Amino acid sequence: IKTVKIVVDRDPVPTSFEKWAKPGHFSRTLAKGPATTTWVWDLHADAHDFDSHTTDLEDISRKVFSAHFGQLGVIFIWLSGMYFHGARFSNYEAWLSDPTHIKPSAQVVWPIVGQEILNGDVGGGFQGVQITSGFFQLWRGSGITSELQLYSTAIGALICAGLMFFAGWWHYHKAAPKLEWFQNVESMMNHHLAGLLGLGSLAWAGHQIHIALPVNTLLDAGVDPKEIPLPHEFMLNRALMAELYPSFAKGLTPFFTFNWTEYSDFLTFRGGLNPVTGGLWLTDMAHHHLAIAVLFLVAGHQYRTNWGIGHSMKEILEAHKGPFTGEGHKGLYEILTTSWHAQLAINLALMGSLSIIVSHHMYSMPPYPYLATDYGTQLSLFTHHMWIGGFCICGAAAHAAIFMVRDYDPATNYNNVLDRVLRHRDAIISHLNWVCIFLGFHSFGLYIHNDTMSALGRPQDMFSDTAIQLQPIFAQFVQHTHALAPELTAPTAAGSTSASWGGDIVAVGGKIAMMPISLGTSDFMVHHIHAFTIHVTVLILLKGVLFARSSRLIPDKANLGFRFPCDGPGRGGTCQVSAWDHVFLGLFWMYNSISIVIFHFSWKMQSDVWGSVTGNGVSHITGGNFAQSANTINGWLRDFLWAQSSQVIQSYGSALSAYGLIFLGAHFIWAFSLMFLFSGRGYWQELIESIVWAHNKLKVAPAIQPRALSITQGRAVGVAHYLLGGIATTWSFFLARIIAVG
Amino acid sequence: DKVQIVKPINGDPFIGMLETPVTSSPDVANFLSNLPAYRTGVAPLLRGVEVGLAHGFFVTGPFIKLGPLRSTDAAELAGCLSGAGLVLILTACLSIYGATAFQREEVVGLKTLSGRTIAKDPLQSSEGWASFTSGWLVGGLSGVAWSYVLTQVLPYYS
Amino acid sequence: KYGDESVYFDLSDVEATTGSWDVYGVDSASRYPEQQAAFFEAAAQGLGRREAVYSVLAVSAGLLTVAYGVKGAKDAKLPITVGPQQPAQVGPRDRI
Amino acid sequence: SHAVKIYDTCIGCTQCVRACPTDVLEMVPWDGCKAGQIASAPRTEDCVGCKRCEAACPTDFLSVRVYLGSETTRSMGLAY
Amino acid sequence: DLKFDDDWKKSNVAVHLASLFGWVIPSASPCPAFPDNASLFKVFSDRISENLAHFPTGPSADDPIWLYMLTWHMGLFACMMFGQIGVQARKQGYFG
Amino acid sequence: WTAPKLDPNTPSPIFGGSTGGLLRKAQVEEFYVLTWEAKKEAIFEMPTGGAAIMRKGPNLLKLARKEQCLALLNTFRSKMKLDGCIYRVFPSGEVQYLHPKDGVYPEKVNKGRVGANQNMRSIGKNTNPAKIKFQGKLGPFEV
Amino acid sequence: WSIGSTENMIVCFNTTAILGAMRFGLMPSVKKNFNGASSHTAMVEQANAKTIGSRDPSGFTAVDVLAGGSLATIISAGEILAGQVPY
Ligand code: CLA
Ligand code: CLA
Ligand code: CLA
Ligand code: CLA
Ligand code: CLA
Ligand SMILES: CC1=C(/C=C/C(C)=C/C=C/C(C)=C/C=C/C=C(C)/C=C/C=C(C)/C=C/C2=C(C)CCCC2(C)C)C(C)(C)CCC1
Ligand SMILES: CC1=C(C/C=C(\C)CCC[C@H](C)CCC[C@H](C)CCCC(C)C)C(=O)c2ccccc2C1=O
Ligand code: SF4
Ligand code: SF4
């Protein structure tokens, strides 16, 4: 039972540019110098492969910690930039007065080559590139009413970025912690729950209560942002705050006497949306963050660090074992306290799932004022966080495989929960593959059969709502229970969590903030498609992880490495056997799945939720054609791809001409990726030989010998350009469409 | 005292199988062992009979209730003729499998999990598979006809 | 011996060494009623031969296709057998 | 099975033999090289064709070459 | 040994009865959230009676029987699974 | 090395079982046996998947492929510095001494080995395939 | 709220009961809890936290006091806020 304490080596590495002058210092093969042009790609590929640089885990941990400091400095630079642009290059103050009709914009282009046309008529006597990041909605929900506040926090963010870089330099060059510092996971959880999430949520609840809540209440009442009292005048002047919310006239006495019901005016459980702004009630969000803060503060006292109270996570792992799982979770504490890649796999998986949940929960329960009404930012946020989630999950698989090849020790995992998974990986993969086939056959024939029947002129034999009812009865049941939650199972809630469950469509300024979402047969089919695509991505990734060390084809695959191209053309051909290549295909399917998720989201919202109420029912964007057309591949091709592409392809001569140019360019990059994907190194190397002959003819032969990309690098470039082109095509399409239609 | 359930196949941990509550449970084992395919001492023809009857009986139903003529009054007759046609196709598949599959000696024997040496299944031979195919054909056509009869006869059918 | 402790190789017990185990098979000689067995033996008397089944399926294929093209298709009221029974339409450039 | 051929440029560095995952290659005495040994491929039937020997051969051009031919069970590397 | 144990279930009648009835009784206790302080088992049985009058006609998609069925069966099965786990673990050396 | 070592019934390594073991190919066609002498009890990695404990003294292990046996033996030699031999076992019940096939590991030159599949020429001195046209030749390499 | 009120008496009773429980080994404490114990019915002395600094003859610590007070305040909050929910 080691005592948790602070441990450091003083001045472990001097601060010097001698390593900057020498590329590839971190390695041994790259340190000697470039013999061939492969060396550049090798340098960049293993730039952040700290495990392959040094054997000792202490130096790796220090490198990771200071690299995290550098990333956080980069993120703070990005935030400083966004706030600074929102201050000197935006119409945030104009948008504040008319958020329903002024398009948010925080980027203005220089008028050089005729690109000034990209400065669109976004309103407010302003021109610029309309933004979809939702930053304006975030600032309004945070209570920012002036550009000076944006400038002030931007400068703060820049200072914090400098501090983050200084902290990384300090914790690598001056005060690098020892390995026993990083391995204090109990303390880590205690702090990252109570102090990062707990105290962070408490701080944000306090901000929301004292700054965002009064300012946004005045904005809701119709008060001009330039007439609202400043935030310090609300936080400090208790009479001013109590004028808006009379519970503040009682001070902290109800808080400290457990008379918390007196705070019910500014700490509510209303549920639903603000009818004026179309966002979540800010009293609800303040109460939310308060309870989250309390829950995390309590949960951060779970683990024992230096005083006997608390848990030891090793013990609670090892005590969980059973008749089917052998020794159970024994040895996993060693895995996750002596392998960075294992932790990275778990954390990336959970981060990716979380980003996905974030997208779902933000479209369905818009947390910001005038966010739902701005359809472009809502679609953009959903699609963005979906893509981030899918990428993070693919990385989680990759780092799981990396751990499995490199840091997995059979001695410390004899009969534990991991070794038994490795002992029936054949059953897992075969059942998953069977599931994957089943799912694909059924779901695709649900679309292909419909295509065939429609083409044969047999709509009564289709799987549409009219012909054959494949109703998602279970999802409709969940919708019903959630719409009736505020009456029986959530009695203190004044309303449902989202209006998507049912009843009382929410409209702000004509356009619909939120509308109950129905689920017909097209929703059934597309959701089973989603499950199919997820299950195939999981098949690929889990097969890569489980067969990372060995297989019946290659038993000695662990020593071949995590990232090797093949084992040769023998055994019939051993291409793409490495778990890295599984992440390649895994990445591909991930992309494919997300492409369907975001297409379903965009079409369903344009057809059945988004629109404008005019007193004579809803006028949706596409007119509700999803329910009757999204049961056929032809329907998606025609009524979603072909129909909604008119905005992006006819965007030339307007501010969306940039989106049209990116649409074409991303198409090109995707097709360009097909070059790297469909070809192989041998051809390109021979072409290089001919070109090198041509150069040697004129004595232009480089000292660094030209080489074709490695096979792994060729696959890497292919998947990277494919993902770039596909996603940027969808990005340009979605943004141009949703900005033009509004 | 710390009982482990999942065990290797027949106690040999070097064969590609594991005995689990799905594979070696007494109820599962008794159900599967009592199915006609696993009655190796019985004549292949009669095992094929029951097989065909069960299979041809159920396989008709999808064609009845989801076929092109499901709405028409002739839905049942169409579905049963579809089922009979599928039985004929499966008879062709069985005949070709029986002609091609059993061409090797298979010198290695077979034993039970208790270690009792037992003779090979007569079904697992060319002539035995031919007899099984004939039993399949008779059983499948009888089962399809029975499904037709029951759709025309059964009181609560709709 | 195969039954020894930690021994799973035996050149005398090749079946246990190689894993060729009858998992669920049962060698009971009779399960069905004998007369039911006799009926279904007689029902498949000539079909026990593979080439007899080949002749059966060839004849069945011919009879089913002939009957379908002569009588079966019309009886099922296929739309293809029913005539168009509608006025025709002219393509662009007045091309019928 | 495949065909594996050893050529007289072999220096007897043994790397082909050490790289073979199926024990196809072996070192035999030979007066042609300084090291006093040449590789050979007696167990050619076991050659899966993975070409690890060619990857591990330092001599330019390769002294060991694998020519993929008739595919058998062992050459296909099947556990079934 | 390494042979599969045919008594893997360890099905104990006392476990079955304890889990079933020690979920039924708490689920038959008064619950002030439900109307008339009715229990989850009470409202579930009421919905069963109302839907069993129309035996062929299934319950409507909006009828409360589904939520009661889920929220009762979860607790039941939780009691069954945890009761088996706890009994077989106490019998073994997992606890003492 | 007067005679190849015979194959006794030696204890197998402790293993909980796996789905990666012998398939029907062991029954119909062949399977391979790896036997090695262990200096001490230790945990090694199965080439099929999972972790097993080898017993002190001789051990016997049956695997589907020669490649699996040789990979595991190479692990034992390079990490644990053990000695092992491989047999091929047919369904008829005749084993077959395989590794090293001489009593000497192939990487070490041993007297008595005869060169097989050796072309006493460089790779470029092979004739063109057009010269061996319409001949029962595998290729330029076999002439 | 006042001295002798129901909420004050609830919280005072909760903190007294909790501190007494973990002072006399009835509740897990700094110097005796389930870390490295055997079964549910027996706690064990924690050598890592043994003699961590106290002047109380049973070895009651300040962290014991803080933990018992936090848990008591948590429980008192739960009990008092029952009956304050709107419904
Ligand atoms: C109350 C205590 C506390 C808090 C708030 C944090 C917060 C954080 N830690 Mg953790 N950490 C703690 C205690 C704490 N730690 C303890 C006790 C240990 C030792 C066991 C560690 C060991 C640890 C490791 C090994 C790593 C982190 C990382 C991180 C950062 C993750 C990025 C993120 O979520 O951005 C949230 C971003 C913000 C909250 C913005 C402000 C950023 C600053 C840095 C917050 C200040 C926190 C600091 C503890 C207080 C200043 C102390 C300083 C003056 C000495 C996050 C800033 C990772 C990281 O990114 O490294 C930099 C990482 O690799 N921590
Ligand atoms: C982290 C989040 C956060 C923060 C910072 C605050 C902060 C504040 N709240 Mg809010 N509040 C929060 C969350 C938060 N709240 C939540 C979650 C709720 C819901 C229950 C409330 C509900 C609430 C109500 C209902 C009220 C407040 C009030 C207040 C103010 C009273 C502070 C005070 O005097 O108490 C005591 C604070 C101290 C004793 C600390 C001061 C110590 C100083 C800094 C020490 C410095 C000494 C230094 C060493 C040397 C001096 C010299 C040096 C400077 C040179 C303060 C601005 C009151 C108010 O006036 O609001 C308008 C009020 O009525 N809060
Ligand atoms: C928390 C996140 C995280 C962290 C810390 C790491 C860290 C690491 N990863 Mg993991 N990974 C992640 C996320 C993460 N990755 C995700 C999300 C994926 C899925 C894509 C992967 C997939 C992955 C694979 C497949 C591999 C790694 C590898 C590595 C290691 C070396 C990386 C390196 O030096 O390359 C430096 C970085 C690069 C060479 C990337 C260059 C930029 C690419 C092309 C994308 C740029 C796209 C851009 C946004 C579009 C615009 C471009 C514009 C200029 C035109 C290092 C341990 C490698 C390894 O050996 O592991 C041990 C390895 O093989 N990772
Ligand atoms: C549209 C193109 C396409 C199609 C149809 C498939 C189809 C398939 N892929 Mg491939 N794949 C593709 C593109 C495609 N992939 C591309 C471009 C990539 C990137 C490299 C991948 C990468 C890839 C990997 C890495 C994996 C797959 C897997 C799969 C299977 C998933 C199971 C499934 O779909 O159910 C079954 C098949 C279908 C539904 C396919 C369509 C068939 C329709 C419904 C017709 C049905 C029968 C029809 C009536 C014909 C009978 C009559 C005929 C004889 C005349 C399936 C074979 C996974 C796999 O094999 O495991 C299951 C897998 O691991 N694929
Ligand atoms: C898998 C996806 C899928 C599904 C669900 C359907 C479904 C259907 N099609 Mg479509 N179709 C599809 C793909 C699919 N099709 C594709 C890809 C094509 C090619 C273009 C077509 C072309 C097509 C045509 C041309 C026609 C249909 C028709 C039909 C219907 C009747 C088919 C029939 O007779 O089945 C017979 C079914 C079976 C013999 C068996 C089905 C499987 C059973 C139920 C599985 C049960 C397993 C069980 C759960 C396991 C239990 C184990 C336990 C004992 C232990 C039905 C609605 C016909 C129609 O008009 O009807 C509307 C028709 O004319 N289909
Ligand atoms: C007998 C004796 C004595 C006396 C004693 C006593 C009487 C003690 C006490 C103690 C106490 C009396 C303590 C207390 C503590 C407390 C605490 C530590 C608290 C805490 C709290 C918390 C942590 C909270 C949290 C929260 C909040 C803030 C809000 C929300 C909710 C909750 C609740 C969660 C003397 C010394 C004279 C001498 C010796 C003997
Ligand atoms: C195109 C292609 C190549 C050929 C690509 C070559 C080798 C490299 C790509 C070109 C870069 C741009 C060369 C770097 C140029 C220098 C950095 C010079 C400075 C640039 C000035 C021109 C400005 C492969 O090597 C390959 C390998 C495996 C699978 C697919 C492929 C593949 O598709
Ligand atoms: S073949 Fe290449 S590797 Fe094998 S010995 Fe001769 S030279 Fe060394
Ligand atoms: S190909 Fe693979 S197996 Fe055949 S020799 Fe070269 S290395 Fe040994």
Side-chain angles (χ1 to χ4, degrees), chain A residues 255 258 260 294 298, chain G residues 15 19 56 65-71 73-74 77:
Chain A
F255 180 82
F258 303 109
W260 298 357
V294 175
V298 185
Chain G
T15 188
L19 288 193
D56 194 9
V65 172
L66 287 185
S70 293
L71 185 62
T73 310
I74 285 178

Side-chain angles (χ1 to χ4, degrees), chain A residues 675-676 679-689 691 708-709:
Chain A
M675 188 171 65
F676 290 84
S679 63
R681 187 185 179 287
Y683 172 90
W684 293 108
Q685 180 53 67
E686 300 177 296
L687 199 68
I688 284 172
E689 293 158 8
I691 298 149
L709 274 61

Side-chain angles (χ1 to χ4, degrees), chain A residues 544-610:
Chain A
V545 170
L546 294 188
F547 291 85
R549 301 191 55 79
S550 74
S551 186
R552 294 183 211 269
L553 192 66
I554 294 89
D556 59 332
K557 197 201 298 192
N559 33 71
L560 294 175
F562 150 79
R563 186 174 73 207
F564 61 95
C566 68
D567 202 15
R571 313 178 193 75
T574 50
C575 319
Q576 292 193 6
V577 170
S578 67
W580 187 97
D581 294 296
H582 293 66
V583 183
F584 166 89
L585 304 175
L587 276 160
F588 268 96
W589 258 92
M590 160 218 67
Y591 159 83
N592 176 218
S593 181
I594 309 298
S595 305
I596 302 306
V597 175
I598 67 185
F599 281 0
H600 169 221
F601 172 79
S602 173
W603 201 359
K604 184 66 177 186
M605 302 277 84
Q606 291 181 10
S607 57
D608 306 358
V609 169
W610 293 340

Side-chain angles (χ1 to χ4, degrees), chain F residues 60-73:
Chain F
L60 193 147
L61 179 55
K62 48 181 173 178
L63 304 170
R65 306 177 54 213
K66 192 178 181 181
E67 189 167 333
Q68 304 178 329
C69 298
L70 219 75
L72 198 51
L73 176 56

